[PDB]
Design a protein around this ligand. Structure first.
Ligand code: GPP
Ligand code: GPP
Ligand code: MG
Ligand code: MG
Ligand code: MG
Ligand code: MG
Lengths: 348, 348
């Protein structure tokens, strides 16, 4: 509803300072590290606040839909909110770093933290501290809950899987080296599973699972199986929207075809090309020179990407309903649809 | 003894592959991430093995001296060994990164991992994975031990304190900017407490404490109080040995006075200088030009550093025996001396 979700929404954002407080209030005056804590306060302020905030809100939704009435107390609520910002902090730590390893300039419409003059390679240690902050907030609000160790293990494992996923990206598409050989479907796919799927979709539901007491390996697997599907599709959509989309598109209607980027668009292009294009492409992708980019898009209309999308997005939604059956046995399908309803959207 | 310690010693090093195995054996062939795991294997191999290995061996000693005969089983032993390499992995993650943020070239006589051609800023994500590896090995050998959550919390907290400590360094002495203002005793001191003291001294004993069952906040504080003393002194010694030491000195008898470095030597120099030197210094430190460095050392003989050391090292040892009393109430002073015996050494 255009009422609850935003209500859910304003509560979350209304929580941020509190978290900031948790993190630096005592540190700030500490005669020894006080200088370190202050800076964290700024590190925190610049980078954390800033997305649409979905991933975090997803904990809060699920929890609000999984818990029984015993569990809807306020503290229980606050914890949901806190574990949410925990995912938001984790992601920030990552983004901070993708940017340095990508020599990027802009993020979430502000100049990258590393580029702020005086920062530099030091953002390496600020990302760590951001990463530290997540387990600091967990100790803070859940250290005495039966699910504490599961949560710790869950944040930590997913960190490892996204990194692996980052590795694959790193090794596959260097941003100072074109090479289209490895831009392969399998690769692309495994890149997405690892680098964003787990942290963006599974992690938030899994956390509300452990919070309500569902700690069965086969149920995490049932959830895992369907959220990963979602998350794959989602990244694809994001990929389809960076080129072929525009009308009221999520703020910045920019691009990175220019950036030798492993995108679903490219990958589909590859497999569906004549050595003529396979070279026409092979040469102009990574190209920050307008003529080039423009050409790149031509090739795609030339090959008719957008329709293949519409056949994809379509296959996708079908396959979701199915796995909502085979796998939403003990859990509330209402969880997967509400999240699904805010996902498959499309633009032609 | 020149028998046990090395026996303790060869067991530890003999363990490394095993750990490597734990880390990559299944990952290596994984059809999805196999490429990511392999590289980790190399990341691991290049950076982990390489110091004298003290910090890790310290767990093993303490444990071997804290446990009762019930606990000397092999698995219990192996765990000690595993939590040891866990500290060694943690440190590697750090070193990997100090180097990038320091634009260094050499480490432990091998060229820095970041400088290996093809690596680059990507070592940012390899340090993360190294950092991930620590909690992976903990899950592996201790997930079902009553001390599991304490250990997790202990590794994680100390990570946060060393980072803070790194922050203070970062902000204090930039390696492309001299400024001697903040090279202050308090600062220097707080830098050391945080960036190396906890991880190098407290962490290893504390871990064998939690392993034997000593989880009292006041005993961790009793240990903490005396190990920090040690660790401060130790860093100082390291600092005294980079200039004024040589005879059979720990391999590389190099230097970094040349690197605008917050060292105890400099700090003592500051406080004990006439604006003449306070400028003679103010100008040639950070200097990679031989005449300069040489001058820098002059100034120190000029002010007579080495003796102030000998008065320091001396104050230090006294104050240790004392805190071994006030604070080694319930614990075995034998722990603190054997570690102490391998610490205060000196060279004039
Ligand atoms: C362990 C680490 C750092 C993981 C980073 C994960 C992540 C979300 C990468 C996305 O960035 P990207 O390379 O696709 O670029 P982007 O949105 O900036 O275009
Ligand atoms: C969170 C992080 C990265 C912490 C790093 C901690 C650490 C041991 C720094 C020492 O390096 P140094 O700056 O004194 O240089 P060195 O031995 O290389 O001379
Ligand atoms: Mg990027
Ligand atoms: Mg990237
Ligand atoms: Mg350094
Ligand atoms: Mg440094």
């Amino acid at each position: 509803s255009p009422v609850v979700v935003e209500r859910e929404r304003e509560e979350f954002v209304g929580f941020f300072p509190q978290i900031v407080r948790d993190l630096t209030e005592d540190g700030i005056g500490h005669p020894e590290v006080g200088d370190a804590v202050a800076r964290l306060k700024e590190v925190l302020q610049y980078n954390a606040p800033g997305g649409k905030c979905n991933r975090g809100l997803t904990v809060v939704a699920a929890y609000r839909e999984l818990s029984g009435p015993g569990q809807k107390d306020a503290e229980s609520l606050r914890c949901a909110l806190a574990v949410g910002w925990c995912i938001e902090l984790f992601q920030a730590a990552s983004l901070v770093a993708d940017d340095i390893m990508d020599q990027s300039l802009t993020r979430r419409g502000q100049l990258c933290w590393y580029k702020k003059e005086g920062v530099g390679l030091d953002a390496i240690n600020d990302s760590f501290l951001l990463e530290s902050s997540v387990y600091r907030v967990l100790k803070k609000y859940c250290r005495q809950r039966p699910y504490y160790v599961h949560l710790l293990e869950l944040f930590l494992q997913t960190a490892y899987q996204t990194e692996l996923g980052q590795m694959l990206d790193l090794i596959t598409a260097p941003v100072s080296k074109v090479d289209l050989s490895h831009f392969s479907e399998e690769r692309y796919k495994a890149i997405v599973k690892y680098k964003t799927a787990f942290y963006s979709f599974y992690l938030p539901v899994a956390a509300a699972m452990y919070m309500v007491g569902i700690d069965s390996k086969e149920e995490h697997e049932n959830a895992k199986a369907i959220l990963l599907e979602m998350g794959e599709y989602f990244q694809i959509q994001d990929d389809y929207l960076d080129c072929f989309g525009d009308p009221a598109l999520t703020g910045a209607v920019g691009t990175d075809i220019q950036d030798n980027k492993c995108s679903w668009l490219v990958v589909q292009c590859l497999q569906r090309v004549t050595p003529e294009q396979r070279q026409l492409l092979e040469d102009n992708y990574g190209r920050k020179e307008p003529e080039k980019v423009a050409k790149v898009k031509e090739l795609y209309e030339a090959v008719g990407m957008r329709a293949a999308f519409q056949q994809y997005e379509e296959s996708s939604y079908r396959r979701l309903q199915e796995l909502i059956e085979k796998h939403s046995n003990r859990l509330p399908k209402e969880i997967f649809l509400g999240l699904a309803q805010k996902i498959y959207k499309r633009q032609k």
